[PDB]
């Protein structure tokens with residue numbers, strides 16, 4: 001459970017992310033795909049992309065990055081009271097997209113890295129720790145739904 005102070009650190013940096021949702025989403029998905037190429041293979045939509053320049057040039061990838069970060073922002077703003085948000089996300093990611101929990105760890109790492117690059121003044125160690133806790137809570141709660149469903 002995050003404290004109120006931890007949530008404030010999380011949402012303070014998140015408010016900065018929302019100034020450029022699409023650029024963050026691009027940076028995060030590209031980092032994910034480059035650092036963990038098995039993740040790109042899960043996207044029939046994107047697996048034709050073979051270089052970072054091609055990824056950066058894809059408007060469709062930029063659009064999907066907005067989709068991802070909009071869903072995550074809605075979750076974070078619930079401050080842990082996110083059952084209604086995680087139900088459909090866990091269902092689609094477990095049963096349709098077939099995404100291991102480990103790949104959610106990978107995207108969490110990419111998120112933290114990009115937030116640190118773009119917002120150092122609002123993403124010192126205290127905020128890094130708080131965002132790590134928020135993304136761990138996300139993963140814990142998704143994992144419980146995966147377990148229910150046999151994934």
Ligand code: HEM
Pocket residue numbers: 039040042043044045067068069071072088089092093097099103104107
């Ligand atoms: C912060 C973590 C993530 C969030 C918030 C998120 C959110 C979303 C959302 C909102 C959608 C569209 C609706 C849906 O299908 O449920 C989506 C689609 C999808 N996601 Fe994620 N996602 C996350 C992590 C991942 C990861 C790590 C992968 C793969 C490694 C992945 C693979 C997919 C795929 C394959 C689709 C379908 C794309 C398409 O063909 O349109 N997601 N995601």
